Each structure stands twice: as C-alpha cells, then as structure tokens.
Amino acid sequence: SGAIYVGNYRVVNRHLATHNDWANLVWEDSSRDLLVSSTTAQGCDTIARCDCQTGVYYCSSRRKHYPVSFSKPSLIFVEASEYYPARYQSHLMLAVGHSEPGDCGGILRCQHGVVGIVSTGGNGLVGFADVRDLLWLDE
Ligand SMILES: CSc1ccccc1CC(=O)N1CCC[C@H](O)C1
Ligand SMILES: [Zn+2]
C-alpha cells in the first residue's frame, strides 16, 4: 500500500483505490495502473521533473529503502495477477529489486523528487508507474 500526496491530490495504484478515492476522482488510467483523487488537506511530496534513471524506492516487505537503476518509461508486458489479466502496461519502468504484491504504492524518488510508485514485480524485478509526465499534479 502507499500513496503520493502532492498539493490537493492523492496518487494511488488504481487496483488499490478505495471507495472514497472513486467518489472524489480526478483522473484514472487502467493502462498505467494509476488513479488520482482529491484531498481536503495539502500534501508534502514534490514531483520530480527530470529523466533520472537512478533513485531509491521503499520496499514494505523488507522495511527498507533500496537504491536502484531503472529503465525509461515504456510499454512492458506484465503477467496476470489477481488485479489485471496478462497485458501491456504503459509508462512502466523496471529495476532489479525485491518486491511482493503488497509492496505496491511504495515511492520511487530521485534527487529531484517523487518519480513514481511500485506497481508490478516478481523474481527479483520491481516495476514502477511513472508520474513525471503528469504536469497537472503541480497546479
Ligand atoms: C509488487 S507487485 C509483485 C511483486 C512480486 C510478485 C508479484 C507481484 C504482483 C504483481 O506484479 N501484480 C500485482 C497487481 C497488479 C500488477 O499488474 C501485477
Ligand atoms: Zn531526477
């Protein structure tokens, strides 16, 4: 689990969104596994606006932050899970790192701010949904 709190927005994995998220919806995209809802309180996270390929992510199944190298956002084939059939997921970045299903939502960040959130994984890989192209999160 986990979210990004920027301005009056909450960014979560679409497959983990709550009823309150759906009832206060701003934007969602199943191909990216992202959903954004509105918040009453202002958040403290800032979004990175860069092309970094190195950063650090939070892994809840280890209680640890790990440094990683990650690919550029791309269209990647992801195996079937309990939330989606096997399909192509867009704007996804891959790295070598530990992950488990409940690690979705952990933040990936670089020197500039939040880059994305954990969205996929398996066998020593972790995948992150990028948010750096969503410029509207800043206004
Ligand atoms: C951190 S995810 C993970 C990690 C290790 C092993 C398996 C997973 C689960 C996963 O990849 N899922 C979960 C739901 C939505 C995704 O498209 C598919
Ligand atoms: Zn950066």
Curated annotation (Swiss-Prot):
Record: active site: 15 (for protease 2a activity), 33 (for protease 2a activity), 104 (for protease 2a activity)
Origin superkingdom: Viruses
Catalytic function, reaction form: Selective cleavage of Tyr-|-Gly bond in the picornavirus polyprotein
Signal sequence segment: none
Binding residues for Zn(2+) 1: 50, 52, 110, 112
Function: Cysteine protease that cleaves viral polyprotein and specific host proteins. It is responsible for the autocatalytic cleavage between the P1 and P2 regions, which is the first cleavage occurring in the polyprotein. Also cleaves the host translation initiation factor EIF4G1, in order to shut down the capped cellular mRNA translation. Inhibits the host nucleus-cytoplasm protein and RNA trafficking by cleaving host members of the nuclear pores. Counteracts stress granule formation probably by antagonizing its assembly or promoting its dissassembly.
Assembly, per entry: Homodimer.
Protein name, UniProt field: Protease 2A
Source organism of the structure: Coxsackievirus A16 (strain G-10)
Span of the entire protein shown here: 869 to 1007 of 2193
